[PDB]
Amino acid sequence: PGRIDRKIEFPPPNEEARLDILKIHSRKMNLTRGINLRKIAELMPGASGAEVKGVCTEAGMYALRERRVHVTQEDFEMAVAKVMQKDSEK
Amino acid sequence: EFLHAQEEVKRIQSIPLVIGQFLEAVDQNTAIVGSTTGSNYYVRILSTIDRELLKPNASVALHKHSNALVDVLPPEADSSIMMLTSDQKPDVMYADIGGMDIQKQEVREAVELPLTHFELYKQIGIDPPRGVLMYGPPGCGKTMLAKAVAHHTTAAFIRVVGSEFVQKYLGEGPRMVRDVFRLAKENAPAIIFIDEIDAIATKRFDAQTGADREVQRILLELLNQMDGFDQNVNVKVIMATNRADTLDPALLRPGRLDRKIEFPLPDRRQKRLIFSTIT
Amino acid sequence: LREELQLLQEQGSYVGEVVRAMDKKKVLVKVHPEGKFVVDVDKNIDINDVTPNCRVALRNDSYTLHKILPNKVDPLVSLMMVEKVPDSTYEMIGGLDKQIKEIKEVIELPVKHPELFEALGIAQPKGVLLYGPPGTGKTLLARAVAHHTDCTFIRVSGSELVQKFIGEGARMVRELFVMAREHAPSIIFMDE
Amino acid sequence: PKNPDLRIAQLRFLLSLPEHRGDAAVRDELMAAVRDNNMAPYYEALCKSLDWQIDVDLLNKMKKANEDELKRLDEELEDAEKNLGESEIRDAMMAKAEYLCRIGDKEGALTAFRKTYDKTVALGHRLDIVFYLLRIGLFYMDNDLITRNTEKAKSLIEEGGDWDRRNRLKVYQGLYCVAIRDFK
Amino acid sequence: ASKLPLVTPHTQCRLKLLKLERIKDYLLMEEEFIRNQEQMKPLEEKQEEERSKVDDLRGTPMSVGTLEEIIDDNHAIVSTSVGSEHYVSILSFVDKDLLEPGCSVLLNHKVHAVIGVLMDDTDPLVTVMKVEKAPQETYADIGGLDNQIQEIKESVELPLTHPEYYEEMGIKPPKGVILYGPPGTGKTLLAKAVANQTSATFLRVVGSELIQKYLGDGPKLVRELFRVAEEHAPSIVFIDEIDAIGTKRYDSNSGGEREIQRTMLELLNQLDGFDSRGDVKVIMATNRIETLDPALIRPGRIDRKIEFPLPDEKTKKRIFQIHTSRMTLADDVTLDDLIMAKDDLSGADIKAICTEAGLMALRERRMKVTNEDFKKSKENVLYK
Amino acid sequence: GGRRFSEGTSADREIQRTLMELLNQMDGFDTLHRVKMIMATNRPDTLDPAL
Ligand SMILES: Nc1ncnc2c1ncn2[C@@H]1O[C@H](COP(=O)(O)OP(=O)(O)OP(=O)(O)O)[C@@H](O)[C@H]1O
Ligand SMILES: Nc1ncnc2c1ncn2[C@@H]1O[C@H](COP(=O)(O)OP(=O)(O)OP(=O)(O)O)[C@@H](O)[C@H]1O
Ligand SMILES: Nc1ncnc2c1ncn2[C@@H]1O[C@H](COP(=O)(O)OP(=O)(O)O)[C@@H](O)[C@H]1O
Ligand SMILES: [Mg+2]
Ligand SMILES: [Mg+2]
């Protein structure tokens, strides 16, 4: 007990904390007006703070594979169903 | 009378000329080069050289005795040259690779789709990947898929075997690294392919043998030279191995290798597609 | 211009690496892979201006000191340049407000205000353990705290490409401290 | 704050330049002037208005309310320095300078924005300060001060994508290029 | 320099007056003799003329080489920096006493002849293992032991400060000291108090870092540890956590348990070899005393065996007095409720409560520590 | 031939470089035509699965 001065637990993020990680990461994407990110963060039942960038970077690929220049709100819900599929893989 | 001496100074450039490499400059009209005899020097210039033709890592010319800057050169490498494009493509089409729906699609998104449609990656801003690492069990089309990319490409393709950087003489290897990427710089929006990186990028080292001190200097060049990119050049590095265990995670940091492709072994669904193509 | 036909016939100058100076205007310089040389200095060069571990120019006929060649690298700088930690800040932290308050009480405060614990008379803390599932931001929080109070964020992984900058063999791990007590408000970081 | 602040600048245009239309505009702006602690931007607008002879008690209840928010900064700057965070004196009033930007004139803004510009080491607070410098540069029509900080804005976006800091920015040149006669 | 070591009257005697007035005559006669050399044979300055004669002999390029042997008639085989070694001659201004095989030398540039020797720049492991300054407070910081505090001074401190008591007894002091007990009872803490007090050089190494990754590198590190300890002074070697050489197996070590064993055989030599040992004391500390080799704990290598118990409930109260000395303790608290909270709380547990309770005060910007600080302290420290 | 290692000694570093030069010259980027290879061993237990 004298060795380590303070131990800090990191929980997986909840619904309020999955939202703002999406908010900070979506700063550098080209967005379309009217998205409702709150619906997107509720689709992920607490994976971690690392799949959030796993989704938001991959959501650009859907808009690029159909040759768009703005990321739409149906690209994210298309992206959640692929990243959480590997959650269901092993 | 000044125009008489203006041409008279170039007697120094005559024939018997040796080759160094530019490193930096102290000031106006005086610089530091490193010879291909291995030793570095503090040298003088010749005034007719446009200074703004210098330093990516510029191959220069040096006087064989007095050893100062003489002339700047077009780039050069011996290994390999540029994939001579007439009788060099290994003529495998995409259709010969059966049952690789994910990976043929996904190596397209990281190698040649950011090669041509570059501005969409710029306009959406999704940070196109610098290099790619492909791996898996032996006999899953690692070398085969690289053949098909190098057949349907429009960009320059540079193809090296990654066990040739260990030359006998000292310093040959780090020179052999830095002129590959210089040749991928000057030529084109090119593509680098390096195979069997296990011959270079291992985990354990030993600074007492000399055969292992050289390999330590091999890796620190390409780890340096992959940091000398500025998102503007379209130089993509494809790298393929057999054992992903025996690799340093210093090589797999973001900024150097961000995309990892496994080639798993096919089971039934991709298995019957292979029988269609071969038979 | 006409002098350049004559002056360029002069031979080149060697470059070296000063280890440390000694008595009677002499220094100890090593060349590329060439041996260590005890050479003298020229009159236009101050001794105290000659830093240990600093390049120089060097003539070749007599090996006389010529000019100070600037600032090559610190080996601590090249070590972090190999590892390339993803530099972070507080502005990219998503929803970790209570942990930021905890980590500042242990690391941020005993630098900017070391007097504040003498008012309580307790020993200042030294070691922090961070835990949780992987991918929840352990690295970016530790990188941010070193970034916002000007600390030299050193992470050790026990590699061997790292090894040539710490020492030749490093029979201990404790040889890391010689670079660490030279960048005195530093932070050591370790992975799983 | 400066977020409802452009409607004030339109309503000042709505006050003066329609000459007969000068009655409901001096009512609803005064409906916003003698609340929300506005002191500075309307002395000549009172001179462009009628007499409004007793505004002294209307000023004294607000310049006191100006001081009450001013002195609680003066009650914060000594507790934020005793146990310092990230310069929490400045870090408190880096949000309360924009109040003092609205309440005072540009001088309490310009010396505190350039104060806190050297505080933050990431641009995400810097670049929001620069947008505050732009918006006051439209009210006082500082056509020469916008030329500096727009480049100083634009120099920050390239690291990162920052499209909410880029696409919002394109609106500011868009309203400036239509302020000048530059339609293409 | 070392002209006369005799001081023994230590008074106003004529003998101290006579001795130094004899030395007054031997000095001035030595002065006036050597004064007559330059009077009758000027012939040079001798301040720089013989110096610049040497400095013009030795060239301005001075290559650094390496000895590997000596043949006594002023020529020896030296190694160049490349690897091609020569058979050069040795000068006469070379002070042929500081020449060991492997010592750095100064060669000529032309004929590579041995001009001078060079001082070594040592070492990046001596300075690792050598404690620079005194660590912390005195023996008054400990409190409560009082029986083994006497024991350690008996073996280390009193042999050094009073070398009279053993001679009148006709005895040699006991050699080795081992400290064992439950974890966190103050084993490492007492060794800081020895490093406070002593004037000897103090060397410290953890037992975990004796094990290496190459073959034979382990026993090589033990041979050069006691090399360093002997070549300085009277010295103290402190080896902490020496059970960790045997309990944990690491996959970095290429040799398995039969390389740990060869390391322990070398350490087993260095404590009681047949070589002349010198003045080196060894202090060892562990908490798993039953695990290690009894061949290493035999008398002859380790003489004194010191047990540390858990703190007693009247010595626990002493420890709370120590760690809460300079803190602004509010009068809400009663220390006696804190004593029997855990029945077997160590001395390390007490400092863990006292520091963490102070950290709870700084969350609320307070200056004194209340009772509910300690109430939520032991919930945080002990129970998890 | 060998298998591979998790890199025990320093000798078999540069043997696996000699071995991976052999594997590439067989079927990497070359029409290996009219060049037949015959190999013999007493025990094939210790051979690399890439070979
Ligand atoms: N569609 C296919 N998918 C996978 N393998 C195929 C396919 N068609 C043919 N092959 C066979 O796979 C062999 C291996 O090709 P390739 O050398 O690319 O595999 P590899 O993964 O590079 O193995 P190694 O790394 O050991 O060389 C080819 O020689 C070919 O005979
Ligand atoms: N009897 C004691 N008197 C004063 N302080 C003590 C006592 N016992 C423990 N401590 C405190 O506990 C801390 C740790 O003690 P120390 O590490 O020396 O115990 P240890 O038995 O050596 O631990 P380990 O068994 O882990 O080596 C010290 O900083 C000291 O302040
Ligand atoms: N709370 C968070 N806010 C923003 N980004 C996060 C967060 N947690 C993780 N990340 C992402 O995770 C990556 C950092 O990895 P990290 O989670 O620190 O590794 P570790 O598993 O050691 O904590 C970064 O790229 C970052 O974008
Ligand atoms: Mg292959
Ligand atoms: Mg201890």
PDB file of N, CA, C and O in Angstrom, chain B residues 147 159 161 163-164 193 196 198-199 202-205 209 215 242-243, chain F residues 4-8 10 13-14 17 20-21 24 27-29 49-50:
ATOM      1  N   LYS B 147       1.242  -8.965 -57.894  1.00  0.00           N
ATOM      2  CA  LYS B 147       1.456  -9.066 -59.332  1.00  0.00           C
ATOM      3  C   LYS B 147       0.312  -8.424 -60.098  1.00  0.00           C
ATOM      4  O   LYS B 147       0.536  -7.710 -61.080  1.00  0.00           O
ATOM      5  N   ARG B 159      10.071  -2.508 -57.340  1.00  0.00           N
ATOM      6  CA  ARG B 159       9.953  -3.875 -56.857  1.00  0.00           C
ATOM      7  C   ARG B 159      11.297  -4.309 -56.305  1.00  0.00           C
ATOM      8  O   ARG B 159      12.215  -4.602 -57.075  1.00  0.00           O
ATOM      9  N   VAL B 161      13.402  -6.890 -53.493  1.00  0.00           N
ATOM     10  CA  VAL B 161      13.502  -7.988 -52.549  1.00  0.00           C
ATOM     11  C   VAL B 161      14.188  -7.485 -51.292  1.00  0.00           C
ATOM     12  O   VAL B 161      15.264  -6.879 -51.353  1.00  0.00           O
ATOM     13  N   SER B 163      15.896  -8.696 -48.895  1.00  0.00           N
ATOM     14  CA  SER B 163      17.075  -9.315 -48.313  1.00  0.00           C
ATOM     15  C   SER B 163      18.326  -8.902 -49.064  1.00  0.00           C
ATOM     16  O   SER B 163      19.369  -9.540 -48.917  1.00  0.00           O
ATOM     17  N   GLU B 164      18.230  -7.855 -49.879  1.00  0.00           N
ATOM     18  CA  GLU B 164      19.355  -7.363 -50.648  1.00  0.00           C
ATOM     19  C   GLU B 164      19.975  -6.111 -50.070  1.00  0.00           C
ATOM     20  O   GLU B 164      21.014  -5.672 -50.566  1.00  0.00           O
ATOM     21  N   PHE B 193       7.187  -1.763 -53.462  1.00  0.00           N
ATOM     22  CA  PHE B 193       6.866  -3.083 -52.941  1.00  0.00           C
ATOM     23  C   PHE B 193       8.118  -3.696 -52.345  1.00  0.00           C
ATOM     24  O   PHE B 193       9.143  -3.804 -53.023  1.00  0.00           O
ATOM     25  N   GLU B 196       9.496  -9.922 -47.880  1.00  0.00           N
ATOM     26  CA  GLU B 196      10.232 -10.536 -46.755  1.00  0.00           C
ATOM     27  C   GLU B 196      10.966  -9.497 -45.896  1.00  0.00           C
ATOM     28  O   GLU B 196      12.189  -9.419 -45.816  1.00  0.00           O
ATOM     29  N   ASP B 198      10.892  -9.650 -42.808  1.00  0.00           N
ATOM     30  CA  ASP B 198      11.518 -10.420 -41.736  1.00  0.00           C
ATOM     31  C   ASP B 198      13.031 -10.501 -41.891  1.00  0.00           C
ATOM     32  O   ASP B 198      13.746 -10.648 -40.896  1.00  0.00           O
ATOM     33  N   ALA B 199      13.536 -10.382 -43.118  1.00  0.00           N
ATOM     34  CA  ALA B 199      14.969 -10.288 -43.339  1.00  0.00           C
ATOM     35  C   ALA B 199      15.560  -8.993 -42.809  1.00  0.00           C
ATOM     36  O   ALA B 199      16.771  -8.925 -42.590  1.00  0.00           O
ATOM     37  N   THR B 202      13.357  -7.185 -37.583  1.00  0.00           N
ATOM     38  CA  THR B 202      13.211  -8.161 -36.522  1.00  0.00           C
ATOM     39  C   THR B 202      13.017  -7.432 -35.202  1.00  0.00           C
ATOM     40  O   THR B 202      12.900  -6.205 -35.151  1.00  0.00           O
ATOM     41  N   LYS B 203      12.972  -8.202 -34.121  1.00  0.00           N
ATOM     42  CA  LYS B 203      12.794  -7.635 -32.794  1.00  0.00           C
ATOM     43  C   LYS B 203      14.109  -7.544 -32.035  1.00  0.00           C
ATOM     44  O   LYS B 203      14.482  -6.467 -31.570  1.00  0.00           O
ATOM     45  N   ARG B 204      14.827  -8.651 -31.908  1.00  0.00           N
ATOM     46  CA  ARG B 204      16.021  -8.670 -31.083  1.00  0.00           C
ATOM     47  C   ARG B 204      17.236  -8.209 -31.872  1.00  0.00           C
ATOM     48  O   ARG B 204      17.344  -8.437 -33.075  1.00  0.00           O
ATOM     49  N   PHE B 205      18.157  -7.554 -31.176  1.00  0.00           N
ATOM     50  CA  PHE B 205      19.395  -7.091 -31.774  1.00  0.00           C
ATOM     51  C   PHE B 205      20.544  -7.370 -30.826  1.00  0.00           C
ATOM     52  O   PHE B 205      20.351  -7.782 -29.682  1.00  0.00           O
ATOM     53  N   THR B 209      28.254  -7.864 -32.851  1.00  0.00           N
ATOM     54  CA  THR B 209      28.694  -8.739 -33.924  1.00  0.00           C
ATOM     55  C   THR B 209      29.154  -7.961 -35.148  1.00  0.00           C
ATOM     56  O   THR B 209      30.183  -8.289 -35.743  1.00  0.00           O
ATOM     57  N   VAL B 215      22.392  -4.145 -39.802  1.00  0.00           N
ATOM     58  CA  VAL B 215      20.951  -4.282 -39.975  1.00  0.00           C
ATOM     59  C   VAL B 215      20.207  -3.270 -39.119  1.00  0.00           C
ATOM     60  O   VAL B 215      19.148  -2.768 -39.512  1.00  0.00           O
ATOM     61  N   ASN B 242       5.462 -13.109 -43.883  1.00  0.00           N
ATOM     62  CA  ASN B 242       4.899 -14.399 -43.532  1.00  0.00           C
ATOM     63  C   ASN B 242       4.666 -14.559 -42.042  1.00  0.00           C
ATOM     64  O   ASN B 242       3.739 -15.264 -41.647  1.00  0.00           O
ATOM     65  N   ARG B 243       5.490 -13.941 -41.207  1.00  0.00           N
ATOM     66  CA  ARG B 243       5.341 -14.013 -39.765  1.00  0.00           C
ATOM     67  C   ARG B 243       5.224 -12.605 -39.213  1.00  0.00           C
ATOM     68  O   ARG B 243       6.202 -11.854 -39.207  1.00  0.00           O
TER      69      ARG B 243
ATOM     70  N   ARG F   4      12.334 -21.548 -38.382  1.00  0.00           N
ATOM     71  CA  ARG F   4      12.435 -20.118 -38.110  1.00  0.00           C
ATOM     72  C   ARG F   4      12.777 -20.092 -36.637  1.00  0.00           C
ATOM     73  O   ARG F   4      12.942 -21.143 -36.016  1.00  0.00           O
ATOM     74  N   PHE F   5      12.821 -18.906 -36.056  1.00  0.00           N
ATOM     75  CA  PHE F   5      13.020 -18.831 -34.622  1.00  0.00           C
ATOM     76  C   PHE F   5      12.283 -17.640 -34.050  1.00  0.00           C
ATOM     77  O   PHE F   5      11.790 -16.774 -34.772  1.00  0.00           O
ATOM     78  N   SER F   6      12.224 -17.607 -32.721  1.00  0.00           N
ATOM     79  CA  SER F   6      12.047 -16.374 -31.972  1.00  0.00           C
ATOM     80  C   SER F   6      13.389 -15.831 -31.522  1.00  0.00           C
ATOM     81  O   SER F   6      13.523 -15.302 -30.412  1.00  0.00           O
ATOM     82  N   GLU F   7      14.391 -16.033 -32.377  1.00  0.00           N
ATOM     83  CA  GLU F   7      15.650 -15.302 -32.442  1.00  0.00           C
ATOM     84  C   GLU F   7      16.508 -15.538 -31.197  1.00  0.00           C
ATOM     85  O   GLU F   7      16.794 -14.634 -30.422  1.00  0.00           O
ATOM     86  N   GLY F   8      16.900 -16.794 -31.015  1.00  0.00           N
ATOM     87  CA  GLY F   8      17.771 -17.131 -29.911  1.00  0.00           C
ATOM     88  C   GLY F   8      19.194 -16.625 -30.051  1.00  0.00           C
ATOM     89  O   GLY F   8      19.586 -15.704 -29.329  1.00  0.00           O
ATOM     90  N   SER F  10      22.701 -15.122 -32.292  1.00  0.00           N
ATOM     91  CA  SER F  10      22.913 -14.129 -33.328  1.00  0.00           C
ATOM     92  C   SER F  10      23.358 -14.732 -34.646  1.00  0.00           C
ATOM     93  O   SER F  10      23.389 -14.025 -35.654  1.00  0.00           O
ATOM     94  N   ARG F  13      20.277 -15.290 -37.142  1.00  0.00           N
ATOM     95  CA  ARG F  13      19.753 -14.109 -37.802  1.00  0.00           C
ATOM     96  C   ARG F  13      20.063 -14.170 -39.284  1.00  0.00           C
ATOM     97  O   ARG F  13      19.161 -14.244 -40.120  1.00  0.00           O
ATOM     98  N   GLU F  14      21.349 -14.177 -39.626  1.00  0.00           N
ATOM     99  CA  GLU F  14      21.765 -14.061 -41.014  1.00  0.00           C
ATOM    100  C   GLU F  14      21.710 -15.373 -41.773  1.00  0.00           C
ATOM    101  O   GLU F  14      22.096 -15.408 -42.942  1.00  0.00           O
ATOM    102  N   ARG F  17      18.152 -14.809 -43.288  1.00  0.00           N
ATOM    103  CA  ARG F  17      18.287 -13.936 -44.445  1.00  0.00           C
ATOM    104  C   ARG F  17      18.794 -14.713 -45.645  1.00  0.00           C
ATOM    105  O   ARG F  17      18.380 -14.459 -46.779  1.00  0.00           O
ATOM    106  N   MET F  20      15.649 -16.715 -46.641  1.00  0.00           N
ATOM    107  CA  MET F  20      14.588 -15.990 -47.320  1.00  0.00           C
ATOM    108  C   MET F  20      15.025 -15.433 -48.660  1.00  0.00           C
ATOM    109  O   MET F  20      14.175 -14.997 -49.436  1.00  0.00           O
ATOM    110  N   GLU F  21      16.315 -15.447 -48.958  1.00  0.00           N
ATOM    111  CA  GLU F  21      16.735 -15.180 -50.321  1.00  0.00           C
ATOM    112  C   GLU F  21      16.428 -16.361 -51.220  1.00  0.00           C
ATOM    113  O   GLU F  21      16.099 -16.177 -52.395  1.00  0.00           O
ATOM    114  N   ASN F  24      12.569 -16.487 -52.166  1.00  0.00           N
ATOM    115  CA  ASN F  24      12.092 -15.494 -53.105  1.00  0.00           C
ATOM    116  C   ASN F  24      12.540 -15.805 -54.515  1.00  0.00           C
ATOM    117  O   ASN F  24      11.810 -15.520 -55.469  1.00  0.00           O
ATOM    118  N   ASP F  27       9.834 -18.496 -56.362  1.00  0.00           N
ATOM    119  CA  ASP F  27       8.569 -18.064 -56.945  1.00  0.00           C
ATOM    120  C   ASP F  27       8.187 -16.661 -56.495  1.00  0.00           C
ATOM    121  O   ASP F  27       7.056 -16.411 -56.069  1.00  0.00           O
ATOM    122  N   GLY F  28       9.117 -15.724 -56.566  1.00  0.00           N
ATOM    123  CA  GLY F  28       8.720 -14.338 -56.444  1.00  0.00           C
ATOM    124  C   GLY F  28       9.096 -13.549 -57.676  1.00  0.00           C
ATOM    125  O   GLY F  28      10.291 -13.377 -57.939  1.00  0.00           O
ATOM    126  N   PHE F  29       8.092 -13.104 -58.447  1.00  0.00           N
ATOM    127  CA  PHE F  29       8.253 -12.152 -59.556  1.00  0.00           C
ATOM    128  C   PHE F  29       9.149 -12.675 -60.677  1.00  0.00           C
ATOM    129  O   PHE F  29       9.880 -11.904 -61.299  1.00  0.00           O
ATOM    130  N   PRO F  49       7.659 -24.241 -42.927  1.00  0.00           N
ATOM    131  CA  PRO F  49       6.423 -24.417 -43.703  1.00  0.00           C
ATOM    132  C   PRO F  49       6.300 -23.516 -44.911  1.00  0.00           C
ATOM    133  O   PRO F  49       5.524 -23.833 -45.816  1.00  0.00           O
ATOM    134  N   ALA F  50       7.042 -22.412 -44.969  1.00  0.00           N
ATOM    135  CA  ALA F  50       7.098 -21.635 -46.194  1.00  0.00           C
ATOM    136  C   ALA F  50       7.892 -22.334 -47.282  1.00  0.00           C
ATOM    137  O   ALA F  50       7.766 -21.967 -48.453  1.00  0.00           O
TER     138      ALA F  50
END
